[PDB]
Short mmCIF file of C-alpha atoms in Angstrom, two decimals:
data_model
loop_
_atom_site.label_atom_id
_atom_site.label_comp_id
_atom_site.label_asym_id
_atom_site.label_seq_id
_atom_site.Cartn_x
_atom_site.Cartn_y
_atom_site.Cartn_z
CA UNK A 16 42.93 -21.33 68.02
CA UNK A 17 39.38 -22.67 68.11
CA UNK A 18 38.49 -19.51 70.03
CA UNK A 19 39.77 -17.20 67.27
CA UNK A 20 38.00 -19.37 64.69
CA UNK A 21 34.80 -18.78 66.65
CA UNK A 22 35.33 -15.00 66.60
CA UNK A 23 35.78 -15.18 62.82
CA UNK A 24 32.56 -17.20 62.63
CA UNK A 25 30.80 -14.66 64.85
CA UNK A 26 31.86 -11.84 62.51
CA UNK A 27 30.40 -13.69 59.51
CA UNK A 28 27.18 -14.08 61.51
CA UNK A 29 27.14 -10.34 62.21
CA UNK A 30 27.65 -9.61 58.51
CA UNK A 31 24.49 -11.63 57.81
CA UNK A 32 22.64 -9.62 60.45
CA UNK A 33 23.68 -6.41 58.72
CA UNK A 34 22.71 -7.63 55.26
CA UNK A 35 19.43 -9.06 56.62
CA UNK A 36 18.45 -5.68 58.06
CA UNK A 37 19.15 -3.87 54.76
CA UNK A 38 17.20 -6.59 52.95
CA UNK A 39 14.23 -6.08 55.30
CA UNK A 40 14.23 -2.35 54.48
CA UNK A 41 14.39 -3.10 50.75
CA UNK A 42 11.52 -5.56 51.03
CA UNK A 43 9.41 -3.00 52.89
CA UNK A 44 10.22 -0.43 50.17
CA UNK A 45 9.32 -2.86 47.36
CA UNK A 46 12.84 -2.80 45.85
CA UNK A 47 12.69 -6.40 44.66
CA UNK A 48 15.89 -6.18 42.61
CA UNK A 49 17.78 -5.26 45.77
CA UNK A 50 16.05 -8.00 47.78
CA UNK A 51 17.09 -10.59 45.20
CA UNK A 52 20.75 -9.56 45.51
CA UNK A 53 20.67 -9.45 49.31
CA UNK A 54 19.10 -12.93 49.41
CA UNK A 55 21.92 -14.29 47.25
CA UNK A 56 24.45 -12.56 49.54
CA UNK A 57 22.77 -14.01 52.64
CA UNK A 58 22.73 -17.54 51.17
CA UNK A 59 26.50 -17.31 50.70
CA UNK A 60 27.00 -15.91 54.20
CA UNK A 61 24.85 -18.58 55.86
CA UNK A 62 26.68 -21.31 53.91
CA UNK A 63 30.05 -19.99 55.09
CA UNK A 64 28.83 -19.59 58.66
CA UNK A 65 27.47 -23.16 58.76
CA UNK A 66 30.82 -24.53 57.53
CA UNK A 67 32.83 -22.59 60.13
CA UNK A 68 30.50 -23.73 62.91
CA UNK A 69 30.87 -27.37 61.84
CA UNK A 70 34.67 -27.08 61.90
CA UNK A 71 34.48 -25.54 65.38
CA UNK A 72 32.22 -28.32 66.67
CA UNK A 73 34.48 -31.01 65.16
CA UNK A 74 37.56 -29.39 66.73
CA UNK A 75 35.92 -29.17 70.15
CA UNK A 76 35.05 -32.86 69.85
CA UNK A 77 38.65 -33.77 68.98
CA UNK A 78 39.82 -31.64 71.95
CA UNK A 79 37.45 -33.45 74.32
CA UNK A 80 35.84 -30.14 75.35
CA UNK A 81 32.57 -31.70 76.44
CA UNK A 82 30.88 -28.50 77.54
CA UNK A 83 31.71 -26.67 74.32
CA UNK A 84 30.46 -29.71 72.36
CA UNK A 85 27.11 -29.67 74.19
CA UNK A 86 26.62 -25.96 73.56
CA UNK A 87 27.70 -26.23 69.92
CA UNK A 88 25.35 -29.18 69.34
CA UNK A 89 22.49 -27.05 70.66
CA UNK A 90 23.59 -23.98 68.69
CA UNK A 91 24.01 -25.83 65.40
CA UNK A 92 20.54 -27.36 65.79
CA UNK A 93 19.12 -23.84 66.19
CA UNK A 94 21.16 -22.68 63.18
CA UNK A 95 19.32 -25.29 61.08
CA UNK A 96 15.94 -23.93 62.24
CA UNK A 97 17.03 -20.52 61.01
CA UNK A 98 18.28 -22.00 57.75
CA UNK A 99 14.99 -23.80 57.12
CA UNK A 100 13.08 -20.57 57.71
CA UNK A 101 15.50 -18.65 55.47
CA UNK A 102 15.05 -21.16 52.66
CA UNK A 103 11.28 -20.86 53.00
CA UNK A 104 11.61 -17.08 52.84
CA UNK A 105 13.60 -17.40 49.60
CA UNK A 106 10.88 -19.63 48.15
CA UNK A 107 8.20 -17.14 49.18
CA UNK A 108 10.11 -14.40 47.37
CA UNK A 109 10.38 -16.50 44.22
CA UNK A 110 6.63 -17.25 44.40
CA UNK A 111 5.57 -13.64 45.06
CA UNK A 112 3.98 -14.50 48.43
CA UNK A 113 4.64 -11.34 50.45
CA UNK A 114 2.42 -12.57 53.32
CA UNK A 115 4.60 -15.64 53.77
CA UNK A 116 7.78 -13.61 53.24
CA UNK A 117 6.79 -11.30 56.11
CA UNK A 118 5.91 -14.27 58.35
CA UNK A 119 9.19 -16.09 57.75
CA UNK A 120 11.16 -12.83 58.14
CA UNK A 121 9.80 -12.18 61.65
CA UNK A 122 10.37 -15.81 62.64
CA UNK A 123 13.98 -15.68 61.48
CA UNK A 124 14.41 -12.56 63.63
CA UNK A 125 12.97 -14.26 66.73
CA UNK A 126 14.95 -17.46 66.19
CA UNK A 127 18.14 -15.40 65.84
CA UNK A 128 17.49 -13.25 68.91
CA UNK A 129 16.67 -16.29 71.06
CA UNK A 130 19.96 -17.90 70.02
CA UNK A 131 22.24 -15.13 71.26
CA UNK A 132 22.70 -15.96 74.94
CA UNK A 133 23.99 -19.36 73.76
CA UNK A 134 26.26 -17.74 71.17
CA UNK A 135 27.99 -15.77 73.92
CA UNK A 136 28.20 -18.88 76.13
CA UNK A 137 30.08 -20.67 73.35
CA UNK A 138 32.76 -17.98 73.12
CA UNK A 139 33.52 -18.41 76.84
CA UNK A 140 33.49 -22.21 76.65
CA UNK A 141 35.91 -22.76 73.77
#
């Protein structure tokens, strides 16, 4: 069902949270080799999550589930804010700009935390 597809998507999102937190520790510790690997892992996780969310939104549209569509349109817009910040963080790591990396890291945390009430709303709406 679309609901079980959302739970699978939510698990992928939680995997990115876990990897993000271990990447933040590695960055603090200056373990740049680890950070590089975690950033590649996160890019793959965010790509997969984005694809699953788009399939969920498309399915809700085909089902005529107007409320789920509204919430998913809002949530996917917020996902793209997070993705833009993530990509900037990756660039800051490539460039050696730790000040920017820290800034983007905290912003990705706040964007993600803000977006969680809506994430739970979507589960109930599908």
